[PDB]
Curated annotation (Swiss-Prot):
Residue ranges of domain Peptidase S8 in the record: 7-279
Residues binding Ca(2+) 1: P175, V177, D200
Function recorded in the entry: Hydrolyzes keratin at aromatic and hydrophobic residues.
GO CC annotation terms, alphabetical: extracellular region
Gene name linked to the record: PROK
Active-site residues, as the UniProt record annotates them: D39 (charge relay system), H69 (charge relay system), S224 (charge relay system)
Disulfide pairings: C34-C123, C178-C249
GO biological process: proteolysis
Cofactor binding comment, as recorded: Binds 2 calcium ions per subunit.
Keyword Flavoprotein attributed: no
Section of the entire sequence shown: 106 to 384 of 384
Identification of the protein by name: Proteinase K
Annotated keywords: Calcium, Disulfide bond, Hydrolase, Metal-binding, Protease, Serine protease, Signal, Zymogen
Length: 279
């Protein structure tokens, strides 16, 4: 399948080169897989989700996304127009308030919840969790992420936006999960992207168009935007049978575009997520 005039990041993930505008992908498109978006919530009624999204848990008074961030991320995972895996199932877990803040104890609870909840869902092709959040180093936060991964969920987390070594940030610094940095249109590390030896992969994170609340759309930037590209890619690859939750991060690193990025500090991987799609 091919999506013409696609958002630049979708084109980027299906190309060996920057500057293309068509997103090429297998029509299986992640059907059979499930992605948990742990964030501010998801506006499940947005037409772009096509009834494939649902809220499954809140930690606040309401289950609605009053912020937009969670909806944007979800849209990059699996909306019709803006998503990597256009037929995946989306589940929203609202751990962040409408200001986009959360306490670590509630994000830990949200991770433990997913590890359990996936056992009552029909996800024949596998389960992914996308965490476009983080703060200062916390061993308890890292351990929650490690548990989620070990339960059999592909965990993808944002590297963070401090232009610093991600080793000081959680859950970014947990080695066992898939830590994602951000790149721009021109194959440059995004100027705000964290780096360091803990990063596993880069995805598109500058000026990413996706869904927003109120049934709208918006372009925003961050490692928060890069993360769902990789979460969506994993979902896509698991339904193709190429990889499993336990080895998806390694598989995407093994099959990435290598050495394409500029502004990569010595000691950080030079790997950009790529779907390897072949007509
Ligand atoms: Ca290249
Ligand atoms: Ca890792």
């Amino acid at each position: 399948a091919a999506q013409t005039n696609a958002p630049w990041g979708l084109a980027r993930i299906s190309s060996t080169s920057p500057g293309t505008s068509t997103y090429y992908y297998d029509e299986s498109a992640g059907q059979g897989s499930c992605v948990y978006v742990i964030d501010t919530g998801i506006e499940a009624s947005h037409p772009e989700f096509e009834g494939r999204a649902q809220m499954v848990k809140t930690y606040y008074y309401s289950s609605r996304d009053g912020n937009g961030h969670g909806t944007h991320c979800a849209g990059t995972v699996g909306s019709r127009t803006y998503g990597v895996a256009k037929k995946t199932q989306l589940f929203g877990v609202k751990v962040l308030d409408d200001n986009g803040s959360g306490q670590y104890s509630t994000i830990i609870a949200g991770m433990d919840f997913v590890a359990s909840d996936k056992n009552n869902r029909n996800c024949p092709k596998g389960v992914v969790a996308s965490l476009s959040l983080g703060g200062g180093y916390s061993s308890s936060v890292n351990s929650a992420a490690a548990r989620l991964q070990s339960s059999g969920v592909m965990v993808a987390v944002a590297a963070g936006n401090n232009n610093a070594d991600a080793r000081n940030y959680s859950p970014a610094s947990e080695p066992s999960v898939c830590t994602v940095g951000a790149s721009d249109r021109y194959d440059r590390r995004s100027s705000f992207s964290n780096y360091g030896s803990v990063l596993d992969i880069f995805g598109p994170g500058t000026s990413i168009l996706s869904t927003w609340i109120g049934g709208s759309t918006r372009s925003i930037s961050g490692t928060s935007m890069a993360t769902p590209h990789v979460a969506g890619l994993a979902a896509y690859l698991m339904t193709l049978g190429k990889t499993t939750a336990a080895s998806a991060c390694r598989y995407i690193a093994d099959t990435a575009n290598k050495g394409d990025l500029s502004n990569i500090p010595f000691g950080t991987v030079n790997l950009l997520a790529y779907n390897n799609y072949q007509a």
